[PDB]
Amino acid sequence: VVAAAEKTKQGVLYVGSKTKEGVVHGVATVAEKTKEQVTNVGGAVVTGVTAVAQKTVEGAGSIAAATGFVKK
Amino acid sequence: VVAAAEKTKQGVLYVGSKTKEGVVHGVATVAEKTKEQVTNVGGAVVTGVTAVAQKTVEGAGSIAAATGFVKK
Amino acid sequence: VVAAAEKTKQGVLYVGSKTKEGVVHGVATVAEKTKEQVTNVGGAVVTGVTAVAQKTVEGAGSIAAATGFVKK
Amino acid sequence: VVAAAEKTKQGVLYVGSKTKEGVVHGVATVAEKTKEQVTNVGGAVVTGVTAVAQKTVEGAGSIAAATGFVKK
Amino acid sequence: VVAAAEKTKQGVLYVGSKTKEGVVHGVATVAEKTKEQVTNVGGAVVTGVTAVAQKTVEGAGSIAAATGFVKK
Amino acid sequence: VVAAAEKTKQGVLYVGSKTKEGVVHGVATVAEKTKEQVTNVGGAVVTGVTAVAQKTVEGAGSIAAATGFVKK
Amino acid sequence: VVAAAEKTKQGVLYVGSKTKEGVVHGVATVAEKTKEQVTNVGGAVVTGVTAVAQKTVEGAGSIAAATGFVKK
Amino acid sequence: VVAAAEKTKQGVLYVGSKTKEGVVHGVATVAEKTKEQVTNVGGAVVTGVTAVAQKTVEGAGSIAAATGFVKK
Amino acid sequence: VVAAAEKTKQGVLYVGSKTKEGVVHGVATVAEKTKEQVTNVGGAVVTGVTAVAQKTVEGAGSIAAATGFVKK
Amino acid sequence: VVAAAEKTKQGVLYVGSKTKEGVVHGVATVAEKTKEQVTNVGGAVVTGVTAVAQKTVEGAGSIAAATGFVKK
Amino acid sequence: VVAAAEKTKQGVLYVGSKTKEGVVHGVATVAEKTKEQVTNVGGAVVTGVTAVAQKTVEGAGSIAAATGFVKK
Amino acid sequence: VVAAAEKTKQGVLYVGSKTKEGVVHGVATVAEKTKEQVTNVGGAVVTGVTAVAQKTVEGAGSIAAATGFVKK
């Protein structure tokens, strides 16, 4: 799990939201009469009513994520 | 799982949303009378009513993600 | 889990949200009559009604995250 | 879990939120008649009604996070 | 868990929030008739009604966090 | 858990919040008829109605945090 | 206009309404660029979303109404 | 306009309304650029979302109403 | 305009209303650029969201109303 | 305008209202750039969100009302 | 305008209101740039959020009202 | 304008109101740039949030009201 990024050197961004009674569920784990529940989050969970990402990377940007699940 | 990115050097973006009673579910795991539940998230879960991504990468951008599930 | 980033050198960003009765749930783990519950968070959970990320990376930016689950 | 970042050298950002009765839940772990509950947080949980991140990284920025769960 | 950052050398940021009856829960662990509850926090929990982070890193900034859970 | 940061050398930031009846809970651990409860905090819990962080790092800034939980 | 009523002496009533977005207009007079408008009401205007009249008359009941319009 | 009523002597009433966003207009007079507007009400205008009249008359009841409009 | 009522002698009433965002207008007179406006009310204007009249008359009851409009 | 009422001698009433954001206008006279406005009220204007009239008349009850409008 | 009432001789009343943000206007006269405004009230204006009238008349009750408007 | 009432001889009343942010206007006269404004009140104006009238008349009760408006 190797990530790399390098940058060498030698307008209008409009979002308009007009909602009414907005119900958002990002990650849900619902049950009844269980014995074991695991919610293993290792990435990126973004939840919103107006979820906006503008100009996220303009240079060197790297993300390295790793998640495991071993029960044996 | 290797990711790499390199950049070497030598307008109007409009989103318009007008909703009413918006119900959003990104990732759901619903059950009843279970014994084991796993919600292994290792990537990228984006949930919204107005989910906008403008000009995400304009330089060097890399994402490396790995997820496993071993039970034996 | 190795992340690296290097940068060497030698407008209007508008978000408009007008909501009413917004209910947001980022990560939920609901059950009834369980024996063991684990909520292992090791990434990045962003929750909002107006979740905005503008110009996040403009230099050298790296994120390295690792999460495990061993039960044996 | 190694993160590195180096930077060597030789506009209007508007967010507008006008909500009414906003209920936000970032991370929830609800149960009934359990025996063991673990809420292991090791990343970054951001919760808000107006969650804004503007110009987060403009220099050298690195984040290294690690979380484990061993039960044997 | 090693993080490093180095920087060598040789506008308007507006957030506007106008809410009414905002209820925010960052991290919650609710149960009934339990035997053991652990809330292990080792990252960064940010909770607010107007949670704003402007110009967080403009120099050398590193964060190294580690959290464990061993029960045997 | 090693963090390092070095920096060598040789606008308007507006946040406006106008809320009414804001209820915020950062970290909560609620139960009933338990035997052992642990709230191990070792990172950074920020809670507010108007939680603002402006120009946090402009020099050399490092944070190293470690938290454990061993029960055997 | 003479009304008379005399009375000499010697169960389940269920109404169930379950609507959604009901718009009712009983009596309307809409115009543009007039010289004279008259709304002479002299009877009985009943307007509702659930307009129910149960067991209105069980004794002596009389209604006498007269309405005129003379312009010459 | 004569009304008379005489009475000489010698169960379950259920109304159930469950609406949502109900807009009611009983009597309206809407115009633009007039010279004279008259709203002569002389009867009975009942306006509601749940307009219920149960067991209105069980004895002697009379109503006499008269309304005129002379302009010459 | 004569009304008379005489009475000589010798259960469950349920109304249930559960609305949401109810807008009621009983009598309205809306205009623009007039010379004379008259709102002559001489009867009975009942306006409500839950307008209920139960067991209004059980004895001797009479109502006499007269309304005029002379302009010449 | 003569009203008379004479009476000679020789249960559960339930109203339940559960609303939210109720806006009521009984009698309105809205205009712009007039020369004369008259609001002659001479009857009975009842305005409410929960307007209930239970057992109004059980004896001798009479109402006599007269309203005029002469302009010449 | 003569009213008379004579009476010669020889249960549970429940109203339940549970509202939220109730705005009530009984009698209104709104204008702009007039020459004369008259609000002649001579009857009975009842305005409320919970306007209840229980057992109003159980004996001899009479109401006589007269209202004039002469301009010549 | 003559009113008379004579009476010759030879339970639970519950009102429950639970509101929040109640705004009530009984009689209003709003304008701008006039020459004469008259608010002639001669009847009965009852304004409240919980306006309750229980057992108003149980004996001899009479009300006589007269209101004039002469301008010539």
Curated annotation (Swiss-Prot), chains A, B, C, D, E, F, G, H, I, J, K, L:
The sequence repeat ranges on this chain: 17-31, 32-42
Q: Which GO terms describe its cellular component?
A: actin cytoskeleton; axon; axon terminus; cell cortex; cytoplasm; cytosol; extracellular region; extracellular space
* Domain of life (superkingdom): Eukaryota
Any idea which positions bind Cu cation?
A: H25
GO biological process terms, semicolon-separated: adult locomotory behavior; amyloid fibril formation; behavioral response to cocaine; cellular response to copper ion; cellular response to epinephrine stimulus; cellular response to fibroblast growth factor stimulus; cellular response to oxidative stress; chemical synaptic transmission
Tissue expression summary: Highly expressed in presynaptic terminals in the central nervous system. Expressed principally in brain.
UniProt GO MF annotations: actin binding; alpha-tubulin binding; beta-tubulin binding; calcium ion binding; copper ion binding; cuprous ion binding; cysteine-type endopeptidase inhibitor activity; dynein complex binding
- Where can this protein be found? Cytoplasm; Membrane; Nucleus; Synapse
Q: Give the quaternary structure.
A: Soluble monomer. Homotetramer. A dynamic intracellular population of tetramers and monomers coexists normally and the tetramer plays an essential role in maintaining homeostasis. Interacts with UCHL1. Interacts with phospholipase D and histones. Interacts (via N-terminus) with synphilin-1/SNCAIP; this interaction promotes formation of SNCA inclusions in the cytoplasm. Interacts with CALM1. Interacts with STXBP1; this interaction controls SNCA self-replicating aggregation. Interacts with SNARE components VAMP2 and SNAP25; these interactions allows SNARE complex assembly and integrity.
Q: What is this protein called?
A: Alpha-synuclein
Q: Which organism is it from?
A: Homo sapiens
